[PDB]
Amino acid sequence: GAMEMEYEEITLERGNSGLGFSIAGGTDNPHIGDDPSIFITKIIPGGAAAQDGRLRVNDSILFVNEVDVREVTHSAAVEALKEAGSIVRLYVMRRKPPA
């Protein structure tokens, strides 16, 4: 109707345990019953993105590296996080509060 959205850009360094989260998404592989976009469902209590970075399960990814993850496979969204070498740059989507 009359309700609009607000976007956030975060920069992370590649973790010793494997960052401190897990990602559900695909073009050929589903989550709910045949999915187009990549969404959050698993968070770790002692990782690098939960304590040092500032990412929550309710934040959801559109773009990774400044690269197009809106229409890709599961292995094609993990190879943007494992191949960058030491520095990974993520773009998230969240709805506007009344106060």
Binding site: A24, P30, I32, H74, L81
Partner: peptide, 9 residues
Amino acid sequence: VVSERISSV
């Protein structure tokens, strides 16, 4: 749920 896997970075 029905078709998932999840275990990623």
